[PDB]
Design an enzyme around this catalytic site. Structure first.
Site, PDB file in Angstrom:
ATOM      1  N   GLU A 176       0.826  -1.210   0.000  1.00 17.61           N
ATOM      2  CA  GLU A 176       0.000   0.000   0.000  1.00 17.61           C
ATOM      3  C   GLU A 176       0.850   1.246   0.000  1.00 17.61           C
ATOM      4  O   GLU A 176       0.393   2.313  -0.404  1.00 17.61           O
ATOM      5  CB  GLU A 176      -0.953  -0.005   1.200  1.00 17.61           C
ATOM      6  CG  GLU A 176      -2.012  -1.111   1.160  1.00 17.61           C
ATOM      7  CD  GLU A 176      -3.033  -0.957   0.018  1.00 17.61           C
ATOM      8  OE1 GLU A 176      -3.035   0.096  -0.681  1.00 17.61           O
ATOM      9  OE2 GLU A 176      -3.855  -1.882  -0.176  1.00 17.61           O
ATOM     10  N   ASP A 222      -5.704   6.526  -5.181  1.00 14.44           N
ATOM     11  CA  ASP A 222      -5.202   5.152  -5.228  1.00 14.44           C
ATOM     12  C   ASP A 222      -5.202   4.664  -6.678  1.00 14.44           C
ATOM     13  O   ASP A 222      -5.400   5.453  -7.599  1.00 14.44           O
ATOM     14  CB  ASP A 222      -5.997   4.213  -4.303  1.00 14.44           C
ATOM     15  CG  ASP A 222      -7.438   3.978  -4.752  1.00 14.44           C
ATOM     16  OD1 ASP A 222      -7.846   4.370  -5.859  1.00 14.44           O
ATOM     17  OD2 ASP A 222      -8.203   3.373  -3.964  1.00 14.44           O
TER      18      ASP A 222
END
Ligand code: 261
Length: 162
Positions: A11, A20
């Site tokens: 992540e 994202d």
């Protein structure tokens, strides 16, 4: 390696609101703020999450706090899910980390499309499971990450995370 180090690799860590891989406003260690294209809505969610006026920026400690909450919530979600829990409970600890990672990324709804993979995993047909897992939007959209998570499911080792 453990679920935290694993997800930290997958992540990343960013202290300012960013989008994202799906274009959604996110912060910290993959903490999804909102699917809204509205940056102000994301900033509002951020402030609500942290409990202060952040102006789209947080500290490492705050990132790791959200991360702890998010990981715990992923696990607790799996345990409350009648379809996921028996599969999760059948797995060894390393493969459980792959499961948490996948749920963290795509949510319980995201999984659920994975009925056939789940059955193969519960069956411990690891190579077949791994083949089935790769036949997915998930794999095609984030292949490098999905390859790591799949290798973890296939082997029950941390080989993909070094
Ligand atoms: C195919 C996704 O793998 C899992 C996800 C959540 C719980 C258990 C799993 O085997």
């Amino acid at each position: 390696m453990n679920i935290f180090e694993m997800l930290r690799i997958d992540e990343g860590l960013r202290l300012k609101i960013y989008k994202d891989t799906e274009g959604y406003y996110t912060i910290g260690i993959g903490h999804l703020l909102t699917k809204s294209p509205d940056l102000n809505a994301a900033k509002s969610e951020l402030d609500k999450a942290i409990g202060r006026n952040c102006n789209g920026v947080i500290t490492k400690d705050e990132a790791e706090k959200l991360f702890n909450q998010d990981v715990d919530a992923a696990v607790r979600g799996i345990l409350r899910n009648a379809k996921l829990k028996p599969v999760y409970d059948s797995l060894d600890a390393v493969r459980r980390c792959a499961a948490i990672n996948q749920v963290f990324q795509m949510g319980e709804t995201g999984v659920a499309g994975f009925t056939n993979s789940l059955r193969m995993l519960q069956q411990k047909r690891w190579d077949e499971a791994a083949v089935n897992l790769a036949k997915s939007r998930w794999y095609n959209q984030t292949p490098d990450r999905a390859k790591r998570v799949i290798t973890t499911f296939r082997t029950g080792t941390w080989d993909a995370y070094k």
